[PDB]
Amino acid sequence: VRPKVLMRLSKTKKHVSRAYGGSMCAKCVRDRIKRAFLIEEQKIVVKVLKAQAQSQK
Amino acid sequence: VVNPLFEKRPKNFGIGQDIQPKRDLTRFVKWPRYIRLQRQRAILYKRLKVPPAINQFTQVLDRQTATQLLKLAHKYRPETKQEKKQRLLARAEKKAAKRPPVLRAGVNTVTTLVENKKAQLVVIAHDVDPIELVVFLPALCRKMGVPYCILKGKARLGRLVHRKTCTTVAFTQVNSEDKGALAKLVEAIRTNYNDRYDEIRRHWGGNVLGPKSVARIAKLEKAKAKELATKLG
Amino acid sequence: GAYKYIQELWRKKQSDVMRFLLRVRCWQYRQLSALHRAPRPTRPDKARRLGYKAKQGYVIYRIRVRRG
Amino acid sequence: GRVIRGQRKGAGSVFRAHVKHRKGAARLRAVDFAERHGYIKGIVKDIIHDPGRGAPLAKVVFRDPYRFKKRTELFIAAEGIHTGQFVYCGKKAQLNIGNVLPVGTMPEGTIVCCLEEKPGDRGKLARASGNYATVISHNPETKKTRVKLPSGSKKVISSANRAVVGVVAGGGRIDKPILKAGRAYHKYKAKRNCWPRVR
Amino acid sequence: KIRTSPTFRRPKTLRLRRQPKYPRKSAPRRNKLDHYAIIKFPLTTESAMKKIEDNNTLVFIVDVKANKHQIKQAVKKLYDIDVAKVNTLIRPDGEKKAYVRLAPDYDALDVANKIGII
RNA sequence: GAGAUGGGCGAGCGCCGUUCCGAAGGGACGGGCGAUGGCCUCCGUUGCCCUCAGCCGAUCGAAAGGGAGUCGGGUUCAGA
RNA sequence: UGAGGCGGGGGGGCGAGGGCUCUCGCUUCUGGCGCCAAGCGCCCGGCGCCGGGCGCGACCCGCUCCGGGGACAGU
Numbered sequence: 072v073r074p075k076v077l078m079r080l081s082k083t084k085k086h087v088s089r090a091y092g093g094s095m096c097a098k099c100v101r102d103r104i105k106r107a108f109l110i111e112e113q114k115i116v117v118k119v120l121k122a123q124a125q126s127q128k
Numbered sequence: 129v130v131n132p133l134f135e136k137r138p139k140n141f142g143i144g145q146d147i148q149p150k151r152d153l154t155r156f157v158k159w160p161r162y163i164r165l166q167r168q169r170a171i172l173y174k175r176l177k178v179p180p181a182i183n184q185f186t187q188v189l190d191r192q193t194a195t196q197l198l199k200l201a202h203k204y205r206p207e208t209k210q211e212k213k214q215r216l217l218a219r220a221e222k223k224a225a226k227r228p229p230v231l232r233a234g235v236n237t238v239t240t241l242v243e244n245k246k247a248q249l250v251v252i253a254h255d256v257d258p259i260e261l262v263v264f265l266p267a268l269c270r271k272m273g274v275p276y277c278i279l280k281g282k283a284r285l286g287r288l289v290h291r292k293t294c295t296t297v298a299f300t301q302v303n304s305e306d307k308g309a310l311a312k313l314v315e316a317i318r319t320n321y322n323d324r325y326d327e328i329r330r331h332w333g334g335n336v337l338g339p340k341s342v343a344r345i346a347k348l349e350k351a352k353a354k355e356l357a358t359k360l361g
Numbered sequence: 362g363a364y365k366y367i368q369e370l371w372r373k374k375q376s377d378v379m380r381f382l383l384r385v386r387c388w389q390y391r392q393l394s395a396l397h398r399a400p401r402p403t404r405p406d407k408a409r410r411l412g413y414k415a416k417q418g419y420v421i422y423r424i425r426v427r428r429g
Numbered sequence: 430g431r432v433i434r435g436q437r438k439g440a441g442s443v444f445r446a447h448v449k450h451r452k453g454a455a456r457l458r459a460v461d462f463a464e465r466h467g468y469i470k471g472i473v474k475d476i477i478h479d480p481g482r483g484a485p486l487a488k489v490v491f492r493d494p495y496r497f498k499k500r501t502e503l504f505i506a507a508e509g510i511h512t513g514q515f516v517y518c519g520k521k522a523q524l525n526i527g528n529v530l531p532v533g534t535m536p537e538g539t540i541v542c543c544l545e546e547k548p549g550d551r552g553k554l555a556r557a558s559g560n561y562a563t564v565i566s567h568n569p570e571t572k573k574t575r576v577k578l579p580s581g582s583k584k585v586i587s588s589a590n591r592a593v594v595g596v597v598a599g600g601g602r603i604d605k606p607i608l609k610a611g612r613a614y615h616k617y618k619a620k621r622n623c624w625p626r627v628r
Numbered sequence: 629k630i631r632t633s634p635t636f637r638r639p640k641t642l643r644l645r646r647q648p649k650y651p652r653k654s655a656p657r658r659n660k661l662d663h664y665a666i667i668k669f670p671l672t673t674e675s676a677m678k679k680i681e682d683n684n685t686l687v688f689i690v691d692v693k694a695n696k697h698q699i700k701q702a703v704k705k706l707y708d709i710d711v712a713k714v715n716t717l718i719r720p721d722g723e724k725k726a727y728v729r730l731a732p733d734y735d736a737l738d739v740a741n742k743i744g745i746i
Numbered sequence: 747g748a749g750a751u752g753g754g755c756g757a758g759c760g761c762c763g764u765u766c767c768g769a770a771g772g773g774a775c776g777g778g779c780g781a782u783g784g785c786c787u788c789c790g791u792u793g794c795c796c797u798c799a800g801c802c803g804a805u806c807g808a809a810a811g812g813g814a815g816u817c818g819g820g821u822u823c824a825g826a
Numbered sequence: 827u828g829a830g831g832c833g834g835g836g837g838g839g840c841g842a843g844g845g846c847u848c849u850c851g852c853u854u855c856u857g858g859c860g861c862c863a864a865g866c867g868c869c870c871g872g873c874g875c876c877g878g879g880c881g882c883g884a885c886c887c888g889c890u891c892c893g894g895g896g897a898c899a900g901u
Binding site for chain 2: 889
Binding site: 392394395427 | 753755
């Protein structure tokens, strides 16, 4: 619909019931969740591995 | 005893690690033009070689000698115009039925009574805007043997009189009581200004490089003295 | 009076004390606008010679003119 | 007695550049603490074609270090840059294609582009399509560096000024012959009114 | 007290309101567009009467400065009647003509007889 | 594209310039205090203090560009 | 450049010979996220309860916002 008409429409006509719904496509959301999770898990194994470095020296 | 939910979330303000906190930036503000001009002229008075005639106003009277000087002059304050009214209405009631010693304000009144040697002490303010109004005055008081001192601030000197500012204030006569208080301050004053006159005339001011630049040459010379420290032994 | 000293002092525009003040002022005046009001005369003596009297109604503007 | 064509170009008003559809000024990121003491990570958001310029541009998005914001830039794409690639900028930045870092940190014979001619002017040299400059030699004291320019001239620049590593994308453009007078018309219609040149 | 931002902004200063020691003009100017100056005269043209019986409206030559709001409250006050809507146009000769449609509870045909046009 | 202010220039009418040499925001949220109005309930209004701000170039520039929302039938000598 | 961390001086960590000689004060694998303080310490107000302040966190001191030129450009 043309932009200035979106005033009239109710909320549900303009979005999708999901995080980032109505702003991002689903497949790019689940790739964003996987990414945000694997990155944090990768920081963990780095932080606990360098904790070993300060015991070795 | 403690709630285990309370956890400390530290922040790592490393480069590109976390957003920087609002720390003070008073050293990098883009100040208005009237402030920049206001400040970098006080810097010019340190870079340029100030001639002795202007630099002699930085060698100022110290703190406590100033106060006791003001406690003395506070009893020779000229009559405010309320008492100027109160003085002549007491002159009225006697006709229908001499002047005490006062202070003397203004260069135009002071220089005359210095040129006539009626002054016993003259105070000058160091921060006169067109400094040309007072430049000659120390050299004159010395030439005619008048004790002169320099007080910081024409404002506090302009508070003795009930004006905003005042450049100079002279002592012509004092009452019999505080003649020793004046006498002791005189010898406490001419011992620094009057008799040290020729010492002042050869004293140029300013000529100080910035703290950021002196550290640069002192690094090159301390590194110059460091290798010569090991050059012979 | 002091005005005679200030007058005769401004007749020494080559002396070290005058050469300093002039270059300091001329620096500061160069940082302002080409036409702006001055609070008081920078030359009190010259002002009185020309008709200035310190009283409400007398205004002093310091303005800048390109030489040549 | 009449003013010749070469003289009328200085007044403009017909010989001004056609800058309606130009995407922006292609510059480097301004110098700040991060670029001066460490590095800062940026993402290549998209690679776009700027009218009137052979070399393509690259929208690179950074994360502003002082405010919650995302600053975007327009670099001059170094050949080999692709979208979704991380670009690093600063003194500690590693030496890979599409990483702007100060010249003094690079070894000799490093092929750079979008080089700054004065420290902190956001790149001025070697930024046409396919051009590059080489870091010839350093000089630790006096903080100076010799680089040769795409004209062959060697120049002594300060060690502080920086440049993005790699040649400028879009090289070899001048090899294809303009075949038609029409192709030349469209080339200059996107740059400025200068083309049909009466001798 | 610290400067969090590197910019210096002119601080907000107190600004008072006008307290004039005398009114600039003696007395307020009287309204020269009252109800009698708005409505000049009605029309008695063959189309004007045709507009009265059919559409139950009145046709007036109003002043060129008046709004539909001023015209509405004028006829409402000069003739003690209620108005549905007012349509106005500016004639080619210059004056402004206003078609005033009366509310259905008022019959414009008799209202025209009170004011004299018929 | 035009064009003020700051600024600059100019004998001068004025001109240049449009973010550039500028203290360029008269707004907002919340809090605190005082005060009022209507069942001074509760809310609105106001002053003061505190807290926050990226705004970024006044203004003009299209009856073919952008721009929410009206259609059917009837009616006049001439308007839909 | 939204003039945002400049110059010194202290603090800690990484090394060879208890301080001196120097690096460092924390981000490189991914088209993710990042603001408007957690924490600690100290004062203060109202009926254990509710609500504020200050300081560390975020070192200290400074005279040019940083650079680059420079008594030459320039006028």
